[PDB]
Amino acid sequence: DVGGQQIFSQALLNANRRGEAKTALAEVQARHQELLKLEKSMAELTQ
């Protein structure tokens, strides 16, 4: 035969992407602790 075959295609993500808890967005934990510290200090200052 000839020109008797078509083809589909699939896709893989990036390795650098890896997980979802990869800091800069997941380290919002540590940052939240910073923000809570900020909030406590501001509460005192406003008082």
């Binding site: 940052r31 910073e34 923000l35 510290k37 900020l38 200090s41 501001m42 005192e44 200052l45």
Partner: peptide, 19 residues
């Protein structure tokens, strides 16, 4: 770094206000 600077300024302003 920006948040730490802000925290430092707030602590200092608390200090000025404590005076």
């Amino acid at each position: 770094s920006r948040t730490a600077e802000l925290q430092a300024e707030i602590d200092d302003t608390v200090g000025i206000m404590r005076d």
